[PDB]
Write a protein that binds this ligand. Structure first.
Ligand code: HEM
Ligand code: CA
Length: 389
């Protein structure tokens, strides 16, 4: 009764909100459906689904030599295997590291912004939103500065090559990380790669080299395009909302709350990967059967009027306390985004940077003319043309 392609893609906000209201647990129909898929759209039900341990991400619960790096990543694991990797990665990817990243993200962002020209239209997606978060992950991980252009190029190729060729930069990145790990282990420094290498549980358990390569690749893949589109989408939102933008410039302490609202209103991830029922589960007055799939819809949860009053309004002041996170744009439960604090920091830094350097920052086309890169479960611009001066 629900089919995923037609004009849902163009307006997922109205499309999934109508569904939320009329059919809060609905069947979704996709070609090659190896099971029934249940679409879950209410805020409370999306949190129920994402917090439920009976839902698993792997139904079990590129050369052949590279396959592991793409299949055993943290988001693909459940139960005890997940518990272990999450515990291990949390010993290295710490609060201290995130706090210490702030001035580094400020310097990186500033150097990018400072090189942008005033004498032509600037594409903020290609020229800033994409290079920043890959560079930030380079800095976090400790990729040698000399090789950051190479990493940005691999990142750019991952987004722009055909799907028959997208493997090449992935494999090259793997090879790079494989080579770098023993170097960093022989020459340790205060960076996240060292942190990962040296992390160990109190009983001695620790990452294998395979797991270290997989984890590094995961952070890049999970953190590059997502963060890019938070920056692009949030900037476009601000530049089309002059009253909210003026408030934000007048009250820059609003930035953390402003980022929460931009995530709720136009965050780039609109659905999570499919969950599978490990056993029968009662959910909002029905029963999901063992083996059936469930797709949590973040965008409809984040626009749910049961939770957010006038949810269609972009209100940067909506949440009073920048410490509270009410939206599900970073997910929920055991797979809640590992990078959320870093991503929110990149957003705060990016939006503050843009506003501070460019009082005359403005869109260079009417918003109806922006091109969305249509893509399942995503909300992303193809480009963001602006004038800086
Ligand atoms: C800053 C860099 C980022 C890194 C390093 C990062 C890393 C990750 C990782 C490793 C996971 C999987 C964790 C697990 O399975 O236990 C994850 C999940 C997730 N992240 Fe991120 N992330 C980043 C940015 C973002 C951004 C900007 C968004 C959204 C706009 C986002 C949304 C998500 C969501 C929704 C999940 C959960 C997926 C699910 O349950 O299916 N992340 N993140
Ligand atoms: Ca995407």
């Amino acid at each position: 009764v629900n089919l995923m392609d037609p004009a849902l893609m163009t307006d997922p906000f109205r499309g999934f909100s109508r569904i939320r209201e009329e059919a809060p647990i609905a069947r979704a129909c996709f070609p090659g459906q190896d099971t029934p898929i249940w679409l879950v759209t209410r805020y409370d039900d999306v949190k129920t689904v994402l917090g439920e341990h009976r839902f698993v991400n792997n139904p079990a619960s590129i050369p052949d030599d590279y396959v592991v790096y793409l299949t055993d990543g943290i988001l693909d694991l459940d139960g005890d295997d997940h518990l272990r990797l999450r515990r291990l990665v949390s010993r290295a990817f710490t609060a201290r590291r995130v706090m210490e990243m702030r001035p580094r993200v400020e310097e990186i962002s500033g150097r990018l912004l400072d090189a942008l020209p005033g004498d032509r239209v600037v594409d903020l997606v290609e020229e800033y939103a994409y290079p920043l978060p890959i560079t930030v992950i380079c800095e976090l991980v400790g990729i040698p500065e000399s090789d950051r252009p190479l990493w940005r190029e691999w990142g750019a190729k991952m987004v722009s090559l055909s799907p028959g060729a997208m493997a090449e930069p992935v494999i090259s990145m793997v090879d790079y990380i494989h080579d770098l790990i023993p170097r960093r282990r022989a020459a340790p420094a205060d960076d996240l790669l060292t942190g990962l290498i040296k992390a160990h549980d109190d009983d001695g358990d620790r990452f294998t080299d395979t797991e270290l390569i997989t984890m590094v690749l995961t952070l890049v893949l999970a953190g590059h395009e997502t963060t890019a589109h938070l920056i692009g989408n949030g900037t476009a939102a601000l530049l089309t909302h002059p009253g909210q933008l003026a408030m934000l410039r007048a009250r820059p302490e609003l930035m953390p709350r402003a980022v929460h609202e931009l995530m709720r209103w136009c965050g780039p991830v609109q659905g999570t990967r499919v969950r599978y029922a490990a056993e029968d589960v009662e959910l909002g007055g029905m029963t999901v059967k063992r083996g059936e799939a469930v797709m949590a819809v973040l965008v409809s949860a984040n626009y749910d009027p049961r939770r957010f009053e006038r949810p269609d309004r972009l209100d940067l002041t909506r949440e009073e306390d920048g410490r509270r996170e009410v939206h599900v744009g970073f997910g929920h439960g055991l797979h809640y985004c590992l990078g959320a604090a870093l991503a929110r920091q990149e957003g705060e830094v990016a939006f503050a940077g843009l506003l501070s350097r460019f009082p005359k920052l403005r869109l260079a086309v009417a918003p109806e003319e922006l091109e969305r890169q249509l893509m399942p479960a995503s909300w992303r611009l193809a480009s963001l043309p602006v004038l800086l001066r």
